[PDB]
Amino acid sequence: KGEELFTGVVPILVELDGDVNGHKFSVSGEGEGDATYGKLTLKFICTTGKLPVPWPTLVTTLVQCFSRYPDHMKRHDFFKSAMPEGYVQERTIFFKDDGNYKTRAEVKFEGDTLVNRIELKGIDFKEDGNILGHKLEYNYNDHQVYIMADKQKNGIKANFKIRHNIEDGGVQLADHYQQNTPIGDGPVLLPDNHYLFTTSTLSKDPNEKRDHMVLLEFVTAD
């Protein structure tokens, strides 16, 4: 099936066109993924200058096909089954007391690379609040994601809340809303409702002079 496209180490390209309050920017990302361990290792660069948001607010947007699916549930794996034709991923993210993101993304194979292309638009943000005022710590507090099949769209939806640590105290809520649909026409594994558990560690690279993000991530399903 598609599951076989991930048996070993795959390369990962992430491209991101964004516009937040008219602050326009871009992020490109390279890395690889090993679905057998749901291990992601990734570097992201603001190839346009300084990132007008804090890196953590883009972690979610910046590949759930790489999550390690234990043997007994390989049949619930929409993300690998949509491949290589891929899936669209649309999200809407509400930052409690600030604006929000609208993100479209195409997650397909291109040659041997898994490519996550993304458009991100944001409106209604306060220019001195925690997002545009760069007020969040460079840490990540993951949260599980409840995956639910959307039989009418032939794919899945999801709703989950990320907590962002606020410099000097507090947490910024980021209410997440997600649907995925398949791109190709093959059949797809519509899955039973389940969880995806993510641990995420953002580091820097001491030899990169651009505004950037090193990210190591693990995702496994249950």
Walk me through the structure:
With 222 residues, the chain is mostly beta strands. It has a single domain, classed as Green fluorescent protein (Green Fluorescent Protein), CATH 2.40.155.10. An eleven-stranded mixed β-barrel has the order 1-2-3-11-10-7-8-9-4-5-6. A hairpin with a 2-residue loop joins strand 1 and strand 2. It is globular and about 50 Å long.
Helix- and strand-based class?
A: mainly beta
Helix content: under 10%
Tertiary shape: globular
**CATH H-level superfamily:** Green fluorescent protein
Strand runs, count: 11
Major sheet characteristics: 11 strands, mixed, barrel
* CATH topology name: Green Fluorescent Protein
CATH architecture: Beta Barrel
The string of secondary-structure elements, in order, is EEEHEEEEEEEE
Keywords: Chromophore, Luminescence, Photoprotein
Subunit structure: Monomer.
Protein name: Green fluorescent protein
InterPro entries: GFP, GFP-related, Green_fluorescent_prot
